[PDB]
Nucleic acid binder design. Sequence first.
RNA 1: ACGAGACUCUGGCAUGCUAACUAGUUACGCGACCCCGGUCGGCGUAACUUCUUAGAGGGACAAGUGGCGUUCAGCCACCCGAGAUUGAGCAAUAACAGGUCUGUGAUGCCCUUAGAUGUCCGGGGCUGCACGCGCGCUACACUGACUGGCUCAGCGUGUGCCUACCCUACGCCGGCAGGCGCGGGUAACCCGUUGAACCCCAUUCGUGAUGGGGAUCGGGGAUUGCAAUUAUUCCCCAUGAACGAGGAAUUCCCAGUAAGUGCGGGUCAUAAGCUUGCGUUGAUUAAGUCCCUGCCCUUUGUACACACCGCCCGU
Lengths: 185, 132, 62, 41
Amino acid sequence: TPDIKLFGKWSTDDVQINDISLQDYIAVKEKYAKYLPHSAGRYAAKRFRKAQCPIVERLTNSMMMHGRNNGKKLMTVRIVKHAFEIIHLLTGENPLQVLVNAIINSGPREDSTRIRRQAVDVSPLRRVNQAIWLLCTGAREAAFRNIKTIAECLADELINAAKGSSNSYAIKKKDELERVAKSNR
Amino acid sequence: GRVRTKTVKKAARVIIEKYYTRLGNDFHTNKRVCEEIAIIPSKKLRNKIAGYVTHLMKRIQRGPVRGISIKLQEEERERRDNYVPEVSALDQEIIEVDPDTKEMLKLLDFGSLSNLQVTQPTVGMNFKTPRG
Amino acid sequence: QPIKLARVTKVLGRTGSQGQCTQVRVEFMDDTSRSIIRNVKGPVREGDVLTLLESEREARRL
Amino acid sequence: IMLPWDPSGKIGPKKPLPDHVSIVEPKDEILPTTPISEQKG
RNA sequence: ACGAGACUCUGGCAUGCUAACUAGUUACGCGACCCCGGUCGGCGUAACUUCUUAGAGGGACAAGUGGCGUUCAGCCACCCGAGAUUGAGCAAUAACAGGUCUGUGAUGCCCUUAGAUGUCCGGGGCUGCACGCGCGCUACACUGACUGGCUCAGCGUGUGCCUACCCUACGCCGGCAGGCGCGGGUAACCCGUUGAACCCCAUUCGUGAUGGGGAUCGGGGAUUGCAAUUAUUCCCCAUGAACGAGGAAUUCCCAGUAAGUGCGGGUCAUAAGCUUGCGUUGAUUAAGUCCCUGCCCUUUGUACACACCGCCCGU
């Protein structure tokens, strides 16, 4: 429809990227706001084609890890769907906005590197990658040998990480790295 | 990387050497000229040398060559060294002779010559680059 | 204490041990005259923003 | 034995070397400045 | 002059080009049900090649634009597009006392030859088990297991001179593994429209060494074979072991790639935890450096030349 392309049954507009740095490397809006995460692909042909890929698709692809779950994109889009329906019942907010703030408040601003161990700044594209990767890994471990299902652990990760609630696997790994980077800055 | 081998270039150069006047700018028109003027048993090699024939053609209109010898560079070049000027810089009226080139011409038959102007001497015996 | 920003005006190659730190000429957003050179971890294209947690450190160039 | 070449293939191959480019020689072009009409019957 | 390249194969497209009862499609008569109309891989057929098969030609060149390049050689973008760096094969000079005399009726010499080291038959052995290593397969579960329901592949093979061992439809009987009639095919004709797995949809199971895991092990039934015990394989029921993501160390890998899940071929009387191919679902991270390990140039140093796994000093 020319009105608004609603993400299955979710919002496109009123999803602000409230950080003035990561506004380019967050695809949620206007030209990349689609009915599903699932795309043709072809974002891994060039260097900076991977940034324009929608984050629902980035978090979809990031969730299929550890051998047995490899190439199960139809399972992971369904995990995203369930964990998105859960957030609207538990929070009272558009899950895309809660996701946007979760990615932005998870990406580490500094890191350490062997030049000897010296602190450097972090690229905004690595901030988006590490934010997505740490959130999916926190959800992955949280639902291992547990009655709490993957969509329930994934939603609890993204609520705690949007809040900076400190119970997140992603926030605890982020606060560790920034402190350890500061140790030799 | 897309460097053409010597095989491509020394087939393209001699294609322009013989058939310069037939050629043009765009790749497609003179790919078809390369059909008859060159026996090529490879359509990738044909399009490679045709592509270079166009690139070598574009740079000919800017001026000089590697050594291709187009027949209208020769007209111009010959017109520059079949050159006849008017009364110029060996047919002078005043020659500025030196203080002691005067008295060396006085050693010869040309002592008091008609049309020389003895330059006043250059005081400050200073012609060497300073050391350092 | 402040947390400041800086936009990438020019890339200066790639340093580090394993070739991982991109050396970058960044421009501050308080003064658009004040430039420093910064080491960045992760993939950087020319004309994006970085978050500087200390705005004082200036890296060793080559 | 590297076989020698003929356009037929009586002595060896029929295709040349793929690297071989035989740029055939042109004739001596006669050109005027005076327009000639070549009408005959 | 060789090698690189050029080359050959393969992949991508072509509503344009050529042709098809051993490929189809569209329209049409007929047939079935259908609440004027839909579906039909139900029957038959006058056009056509969009799908299919394999032919011939085109098509793509850094060609157009913009920078940088003394600046030719070129490099990076962007448009246009089926592709703006597909994947293989082939592959020099000079070598290694690599491996093969168990591929050869290619093989010098040495040893045997009716006391066999020749040749076949009857049995055993390569599998033996206090241990130590390498390649693998299944897993440690809930992103899961079990039981139903739903919908799609692509590479190949086939009646063997020896040569039987093909591939298998359909219908009966058997819980099953299988058995029995009756066909089709030397194959774009039949298996076959190759109804493959995973995935998808619904059920139960509930963090428990549990319905995770299925080793070991007891009893019984057919098949192949002349013959199965040290169990050829396969079916059923019972038995229900370690293992809670694996120390030091360490391997492979940058796009339809890794990884998961199946299916062909070879081996094959019997037969895939192997190998070689094919499709399917389909990522993370990187566009870099010489820090490790190694490679190629140029200087440089050398007491090294079976060339650093070198040479060499003293008690």
